C-alpha cells in the first residue's frame, strides 16, 4: 500500500495558551512524534516507534527541533515586519513530507504559510520557490541563492523515504491493518429518519448506501462526513428521511462497504432509546 511521512510545524508569536513552537510528525496521518518549545523535548507517540527507536534517536530529533524553534522565532519576526504588523498574535506554519506508492514511486511537498495563508511553496521539478505574495518574493530570492530547494528536494526524495520505509516496517501490522466497520441502524422515533451508522473501521474509505426493494435509492439521503474516533479508527453515517409509511410499504436497507466487503442492515435491525 501507499504510505506517507509528514511533519507539521506551528509557530506562534505573542500567545499564552500554546507554546512558541509545536511540531507533530505523522505516518499515514497518524501521529507518532510530538515536540514543543515548553518541554524542549521530542517524544514518541506510538508503541511501534517506542519499540524500535530510543534515546539516541530522540536526542537527535530534539536537537533538530530546538533548531527549528530558533529558526521559526527569527522567521516570524521577519514576515510580521514585512506586513507592517508589530502587534497582535501571528502564526508561521511549515508542512512537508513524502509518500511512497506501491510501484516504488515517490512524491513529496514542502510548504510554508503566514497567518494560515500560502507564503512559499517548493516546486522540486524546477528547484524554485513559488511566492504567493510580494512579501514572499524576498524569501524566494534568498532561498534560491542559498540552494534551499536543492536541500529540501534531497531530503524529500532520499532521507524522508529512507525513514518512511523504516517506520512502515516498525509499524507494519498497525499501518497495514484492515478493521471492518461496526454497523447499526438508528432511529429516535418510529416516524423519524433512520440513520445508518458505521464506526471503528480502518482504513478511512467507506461507502454507505441505501436500497429500496433491492435497488439503489438516492432520494432523501443525507451522507455525513468522515469523522475521526479517539483511537485512530474512523466513523461515518448516512441518514434516510422517507416517511414511516414509505418504510412500511417497502423493503429499505442500508449497505456499508469497506475493503470489498459489505454489511447490510434492515428494519429488523433498528435500535432506539426509550423504545
Amino acid at each position: 500500500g501507499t504510505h506517507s511521512l509528514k511533519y507539521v510545524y506551528t509557530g506562534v508569536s505573542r500567545g499564552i495558551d500554546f507554546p512558541e513552537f509545536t511540531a507533530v510528525g505523522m505516518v499515514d496521518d497518524g501521529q507518532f512524534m510530538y515536540f514543543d518549545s515548553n518541554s524542549m523535548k521530542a517524544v514518541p507517540k506510538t508503541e511501534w516507534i517506542r519499540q524500535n527507536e530510543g534515546a539516541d534517536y530522540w536526542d537527535r530529533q530534539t536537537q533538530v527541533l530546538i533548531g527549528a524553534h530558533q529558526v521559526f522565532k527569527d522567521s516570524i519576526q521577519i514576515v510580521m515586519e514585512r506586513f507592517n504588523q508589530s502587534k497582535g498574535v501571528h502564526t508561521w506554519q511549515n508542512m512537508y513530507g513524502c509518500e511512497l506508492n506501491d510501484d516504488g514511486t515517490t512524491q513529496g511537498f514542502y510548504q510554508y504559510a503566514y497567518d494560515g495563508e500560502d507564503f512559499v511553496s517548493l516546486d522540486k521539478n524546477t528547484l524554485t520557490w513559488t511566492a504567493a505574495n510580494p512579501q514572499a518574493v524576498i524569501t524566494k530570492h534568498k532561498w534560491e541563492a542559498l540552494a534551499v530547494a536543492e536541500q529540501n528536494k534531497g531530503y524529500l526524495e532520499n532521507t524522508c523515504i529512507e525513514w518512511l520505509k523504516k517506520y512502515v516496517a516498525y509499524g507494519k501490522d498497525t499501518l497495514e491493518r484492515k478493521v471492518s466497520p461496526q454497523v447499526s441502524l438508528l432511529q429516535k422515533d418510529p416516524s423519524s429518519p433512520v440513520t445508518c451508522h458505521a464506526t471503528g473501521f480502518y482504513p478511512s474509505g467507506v461507502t454507505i448506501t441505501w436500497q429500496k426493494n433491492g435497488q439503489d435509492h438516492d432520494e432523501d439521503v443525507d451522507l455525513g462526513e468522515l469523522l475521526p474516533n479517539e483511537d485512530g479508527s474512523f466513523q461515518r453515517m448516512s441518514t434516510l428521511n422517507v416517511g414511516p409509511d414509505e418504510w412500511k410499504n417497502n423493503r429499505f436497507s442500508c449497505v456499508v462497504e469497506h475493503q470489498d466487503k459489505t454489511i447490510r442492515k434492515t428494519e429488523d435491525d433498528i435500535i432506539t432509546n426509550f423504545d
Binding site: 511540531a23 534517536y57 527549528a68 522567521s75 532561498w143 524522508c160
Partner: peptide, 9 residues
C-alpha cells in the same frame, strides 16, 4: 525523521 536543515526566511 525531521529535516535537519532549516533556513530563516
Amino acid at each position: 525523521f525531521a529535516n535537519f536543515c532549516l533556513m530563516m526566511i
